[PDB]
From a paper:
Recurrent indel mutations in the Kelch domain of the KBTBD4 E3 ligase rewire epigenetic programs for stemness in medulloblastoma by recruiting LSD1-CoREST-HDAC1/2 complexes as neo-substrates for ubiquitination and degradation. UM171, an investigational drug for haematopoietic stem cell transplantation, was found to degrade LSD1-CoREST-HDAC1/2 complexes in a wild-type KBTBD4-dependent manner, suggesting a potential common mode of action.
A subset of the 2:1 complexes showed additional density of lower quality for a CoREST1NT2 fragment wrapping around HDAC2 at 3.3 Å. Steric constraints also predict that the KBTBD4 dimer can accommodate only one HDAC1/2-CoREST pair, as observed in our 2:1:1 complex. The asymmetric 2:1 and 2:1:1 models allowed comparison of the equivalent KBTBD4WT site 1 in both the bound and unbound states. Interestingly, UM171 was only observed in the HDAC2-bound site 1 and not in the second Kelch domain, suggesting that UM171 binding requires both proteins to be present. UM171 is buried in the site 1 interfaces where it forms contacts with blades II and III from the KBTBD4WT Kelch domain, as well as with the HDAC2 catalytic pocket. The methyl tetrazole inserts into the HDAC2 catalytic pocket to form extensive interactions, including a hydrogen bond with HDAC2 Y304 and π–π interactions with HDAC2 F151, F206 and H179.
Residue numbers in the entry:
A (entry chain D): 106 to 116, 132 to 160, 163 to 187, 225 to 227, 231 to 241
B (entry chain B): 13 to 128, 130 to 380
C (entry chain A): 12 to 76, 83 to 214, 224 to 246, 251 to 458, 465 to 484, 488 to 504, 508 to 518
D (entry chain C): 11 to 77, 83 to 214, 224 to 233, 236 to 246, 252 to 255, 257 to 263, 265 to 267, 270 to 290, ...
Write the structure that this text describes.
Amino acid sequence: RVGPQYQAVVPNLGMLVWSPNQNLSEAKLDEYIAIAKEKHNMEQALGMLFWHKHNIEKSLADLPNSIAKFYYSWKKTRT
Amino acid sequence: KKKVCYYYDGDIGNYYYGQGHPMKPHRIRMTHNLLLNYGLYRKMEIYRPHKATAEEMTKYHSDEYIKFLRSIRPDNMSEYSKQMQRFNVGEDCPVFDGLFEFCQLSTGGSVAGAVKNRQQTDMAVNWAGGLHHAKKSEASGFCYVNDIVLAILELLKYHQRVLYIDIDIHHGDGVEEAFYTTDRVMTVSFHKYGEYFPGTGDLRDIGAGKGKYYAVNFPMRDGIDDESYGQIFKPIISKVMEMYQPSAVVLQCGADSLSGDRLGCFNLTVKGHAKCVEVVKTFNLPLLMLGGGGYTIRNVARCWTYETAVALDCEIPNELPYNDYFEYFGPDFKLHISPSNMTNQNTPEYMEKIKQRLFENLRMLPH
Amino acid sequence: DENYFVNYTFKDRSHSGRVAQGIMKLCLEEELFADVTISVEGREFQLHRLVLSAQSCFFRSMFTSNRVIVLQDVSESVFQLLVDYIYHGTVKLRAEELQEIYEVSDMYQLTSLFEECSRFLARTVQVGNCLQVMWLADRHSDPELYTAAKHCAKTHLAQLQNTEEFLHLPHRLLTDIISDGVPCSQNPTEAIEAWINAESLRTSLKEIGENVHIYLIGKEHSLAVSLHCAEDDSISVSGQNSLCHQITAACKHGGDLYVVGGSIPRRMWKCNNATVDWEWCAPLPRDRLQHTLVSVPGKDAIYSLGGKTLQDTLSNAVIYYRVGDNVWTETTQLEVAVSGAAGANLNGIIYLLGGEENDLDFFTKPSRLIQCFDTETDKCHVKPYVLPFAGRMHAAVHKDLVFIVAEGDSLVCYNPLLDSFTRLCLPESLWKIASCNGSIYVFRDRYKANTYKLDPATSAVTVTRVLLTNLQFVLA
Amino acid sequence: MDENYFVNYTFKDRSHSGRVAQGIMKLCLEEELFADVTISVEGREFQLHRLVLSAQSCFFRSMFTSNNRVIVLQDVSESVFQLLVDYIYHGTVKLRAEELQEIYEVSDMYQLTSLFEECSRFLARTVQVGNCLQVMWLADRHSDPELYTAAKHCAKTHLAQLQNTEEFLHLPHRLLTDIISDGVPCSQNPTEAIEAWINAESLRTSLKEENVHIYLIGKESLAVLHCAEDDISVQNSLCHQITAACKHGGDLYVVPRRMWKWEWCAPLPRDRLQHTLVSVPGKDAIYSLGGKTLQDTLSNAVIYYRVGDNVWTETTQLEVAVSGAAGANLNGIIYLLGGEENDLDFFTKPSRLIQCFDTETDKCHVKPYVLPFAGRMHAAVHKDLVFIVAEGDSLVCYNPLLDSFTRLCLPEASLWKIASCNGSIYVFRDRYKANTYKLDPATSAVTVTLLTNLQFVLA
Ligand SMILES: Cn1nnc(-c2ccc3c(c2)[nH]c2nc(Cc4ccccc4)nc(N[C@H]4CC[C@H](N)CC4)c23)n1
Ligand SMILES: [Zn+2]
C-alpha cells in the first residue's frame, strides 16, 4: 500500500550505568570484581566503581556500605 | 578505536507476551547476561534507556493509535472490544501487562543510540529494539511501536542520507512503507519470499514517486548457506555504498536467519550471519546496531554476543562463560553452532540473475 | 517424412481402435469366418484362430502345433465369459466364480485378466479363506496375493490357531507366516506349540506388538484420545493424551501421531502413544492453513500439500518432511492450487480430492477435481474425470481403493485404476471415516449412536459401542 | 453405480485395442499364418486374411459374405496393392506423390475412409495451376467436397492462365458454372476466359467478381504488397507505436488500448504488451491471447473481438501463460507456439510449447510435443499446416493432424519473417542490408524475388 498517512513525514538524557576506565587495568579490575563478589554482582561492582570516579580503592572501601526473572526461575528449575 | 555505546534496561525481560507466544523479550537480558560473563561489558559504554514520552513517540504513529496503546489494559479489555478489531491487536499482537512500558523501553534505547547523530560515538548497540513491523495505521506481526522508523527520522535531522540494512528473514514491510515515497532513506532488505509472513517484499516492487530505485528488496528461498549469503551480500552492499554514499547506516541484525530458528527457514551459522557486520564496519561510517526478530533464545543470545564482540573488534573463546543462563545451553556449551545439513534451493543461476537485476537497478540511481 | 509435399509416412492413431471396433461388431454380432469349433462340457463355440492367437499365447501354441478342440478343466460359463472378454475386452467379474476364472487366466497366460483377478482376490481376502487363498497363491506363484494372505494370517493367527487348517499346513508356509508381523497380543507361542501337536519356527518368530491405529482429536484444552480395535467388532481406549494447544492439522505416520498447531501455527509435535511426553519436530517452514498432510511409509515422509496463505491466496506448494533427517524440503508444485482437499496415499501415489478451487471472479468455489502426484517420479497431473460431489470431505484408503465421504449421506468407492465410482448411502451433518484392522468405522461430526462399523460387502452398517463433544480430526 | 467392488463389478481393459492391434500386426506380416485366402493382383500373390480385410473395410465384407479360391481384381497396381495391404495391417503407410491419384481412386472405391481423407488432404495441399482441372474433375467424379472446394479456389485465383489450357476448353458447363460461382478477381480478366469457352446466359450471369494481401510495418512508422505477374508489386504511414497487429480480410488492424484500421475502433479492455493476435473467421472474431501485463507479469487472459459489433468479450483463460508466442489459425483452432515463459518465479525464459485453443467449444489445452527450437518464432499457415521460422535459418513444418515435424534448410544470408500467400511462401529478413524470397516446399528450393526495419509482417 502507498499509505500517504502510513508513510513517515520526512522533513540524550541517558543514564550512564557503566563506562570504561582507561587508567584502571583489566587485571586490576578483574581482581577487584572477584574480591567484591567474594566479600560483599559484577554489574553492581562496576556501578559502584564508576560512581567513585573510577577509584578502585574508594569502591573497595565503600563496598561493605502480573508484575516484574521470578517467573523465569521456575522455568529454569523445571529444565 | 570505535566508541561503542550499549543500551539495555534492567527490567525489560519482565514483559512476557503470554504462554505460547514465540516472542520472548527476556532473550535480550540473556544476551546482556552473557556480556557480563564474557567480560566484554567492561570495554563497552553501558547506558540506561529512558522511557520515551508519548508526544515524542507519536512523531511517526498517529495520535489516536498512541492513545489506544496507552489506554489498553488486560483488565479493561471488555470495554475496548471494537478498537482491537481495527488495530490488529488481540490475536497477532497479544495484550500483556505493561505493554506501553515495554514499548517505551524498546523505543528509548533506539532513540538514544540514534541521538548520540551528535558525533559523540561511532557504534550504538541496542538489542532492546529492532521492531520493524509496526505500521503507522496499526500494529502488525509481533511489533507494536516501530522504533526503527523513529531512530531513522531522528538521524535525518542532521544526516542527509540514511541507509537501513535489514538481514532478518521477514521483509520488515513497516520500515519500507514508512520511507517508500521519500528518497532520504534507502532500505535494503534480504528476506524470504513466497507464502511467508510478510508477502510484500519482491523484486518487482520499488519505492514509488521520488523513491524510485531506492527500496532494494532481495527475495530468497529456504536453506541458503553462509558462503552464498556472504558472496551475495558483499557485492550488493559495496555497490550500494559506492552509488548512494550514505551518511550513516542503520544495521538491523535479525536472529531469525540462524539455523534451527522456530520461525525461520534459513540455514546459517554465527559467522555466516555476523559477517555482514564485519563487512559494513569496513566502510568507516557511523553505525547503529539494533535487535529484531529472534525466537531461538539460545541462538539469539550467542549471535548477539558475537555481533557485539565483533563490533568491539575483540575476540572471545568458543567456550561460553559460566553465566546465570548456562543451564539450558546446548550440551556442547559452545558459542558457535554447526549448521544443519539442509537442501539449498538457492541455485547459483537464480542468485546471479537477481544480483544482475539489482545491479541494473542500482545503475539507474542518480549520481 | 522428409517432405510433406513429396513423400511422407502416414500414421493413423484410430487404426488400433478401428480394428478393435471391427472385431466385436463382426466376430460376435454376426459370427463369420469361424474356422475353429471349440467344445467345453459339450458346448460348441465358433472361434477364430487369429484373434485367439493375438490375445492368448496359450491357444497360439496349440494352433501352431484340428477339427474340434476339447477342453476339460474349464466349465461352460467361465469359458463363455472368458471368450467374451477376449473378443470385447470387457467382462463382469463375480466373486462366486473368482477362483476358477483366476486359475484359468493363469493357465491361459492372459496377464490382463490374471492381474485383475489377483487384485480381486487380494482385495476380498478374509480370515475364513486366508489360508486357502495363501495356498492357491503359493501354487500359482503370485507375489501380491501371497503377501496379502500372509499379512492377514499374521494379523489374525490368534483366531487362526483353531481353524482346523493351520494344523494341516506345510512347514514352509508356517515359517513364512511367522517370519514377520504376528504381534505378541496374538500369543504366537501357544500357536507354535500347538502346531507341533520344531526348531526353525522357534528360532524365527518376530513379535511386532500391538500399536494404536486410531486417533481422535477433539473437544477443542484440546484432547487427543486413542483407540484400539480388539476382540470382535469392538473398540477400546488406551490413552487420553492432551496437548493443551490449538491443533489445526495432523497426520498419522506409522505408530506415531504427528500434530501441527498452537498460537501462530507453525510448530510440530509428535506422540509415540507410549508416554505423555510430546517430542518436538522441525517447525513448518510455510505460513499456510487448511493444508493436507499425508504420510508415506514407503518413503518414510510426511507431505504437506495445498492450503491458503495469509494473503487470502491459494498456494499450490508441496513440501515433504523426512522423519529421520528431520528436514523439510520443497518439491514439485501442484497443477492447481487447492485448500482443504482430502489427501489419500495409495502405494506411493498421493490423491487430492476436492477442496476450494480458485474461481474466476476472485472466489473459492467448492472443487471436485482429482489430482494424483507420483512420489517416485515427483510429478503430478489432474484426472480428466471429476467427483460426483464438490466441497469438504474425508477420504480413507482401504485395500486398493478409496472411500470418500462428503456433505450429506453419499459415500463413493472411487478406484484409481478403473476410474470408476460406486455410490453408497450412510444410515440417516458431515460424517468422517477411518480404516481400522479390516473394517470401516464412521464417526459423526457431533454427538450428544456415534460410531458405526461397516464393510463394503453387503453394505451392512451396525451400531458399535471417553466422550468428545467435538470431533475435529480422525486419523487411521 | 450399483456394482460393489467387493461383490460384483465389471472390468474394462483399456489395453485390449492395443493388444489386438499388436497381435494382428505381428502374427500376420512377420509370420504368415491362418491366411485362408489368396489374392492375385497382376500375377502377384498375397496371403491376406478375410477377417482383417473385412474389419475396417466393408467392400471385402460385402463380397466375402456374398460368395474359397484365388480372387483377381481389375485395376490395381502391384505396389499400390502392397502399400494398401501394409496400411490395412500395419496401420502406417508411406504416401508418395508418384502413386497419388491411383491410390486415391482405389481408396475411394474401397471402404477406407481414413486413407481416403488423407489422400484428399494430400491432393489438396499439392494442387497446382497446371493440373488444377484434372484434380477438379477427379473430385467431381468421386464424393469429396473438400477437394472440390480446394480445386475451385485454386482455379478461381488463377483463371487468367486458364483461358486456353486445352482442359478449360473441353471443360463441361456443369464444372464451369461451379468454378465461376466463386468470386474470381477482375484483375484476372474473367470475361475473356468465359468468352473463350469452347469457341450460356446463366453462366455469364454467374460471373461475380484483387485486394492487398501483404502488409509490411517498418521504418519505426510506415506500413507499406501485391503478388502479381509470375513469382511482387507495391505507402500509408500511421506514425504510431504498435505492440500487436492482425489482418482480417484485407483490414489491417493495429493495436495500450488504441485501435486503428486509420479508423479508430473500440479500446482494449486490458492493457497488455506482446500479445498474440489472430483473425479466426470461423467465429468471425479477432482473438488476443497471452501477452505481458503492465506490471511486468505474464498475462493469462483471452478476449474476443467481433468485427460486426466491437464488443471485446472475455472467455476461458489459457492453462499456461505465455508472451511473445507465435499465433496460427487453422480451421477455427488457434495454435500458440513457443514464447517467453515464467522461470524462477521472477524472470522469463524461451519456451517451446504448443497451446491449442478450440474457439467453437471455447476450450484450451497444451500438447505434450515440444517445438524443435525455442525462443521468439514466426508462424504462417500455408495449406492445412504451419511453417515456422526464427533466427538460425532452419525452417520447420508442423501439421497439427499428424504428430511429426519436418526440418528444412535455409540460406545463411537477423530473425526471419515468414509469410503465407496464395501463390507460395514468402520469407523476409529483419535486416534490410535478405530481400523477398519464394520457396517451394516440395522441392525445398528458394529463389529471390525500402524499409530499414521490419518489425511486423502480416499475410
Ligand atoms: C516477524 N514475525 N514472526 N512471526 C510472524 C507471524 C505473525 C503471524 C502469523 C505468522 C507469523 N504465521 C501465521 N499463520 C497463520 C495461519 C493461517 C494461514 C492462512 C490463512 C489463515 C490462517 N495465521 C497468522 N495470524 C493471523 C492473522 C490474521 C488474524 N485475524 C488472526 C491471526 C500467522 N511475524
Ligand atoms: Zn523477523
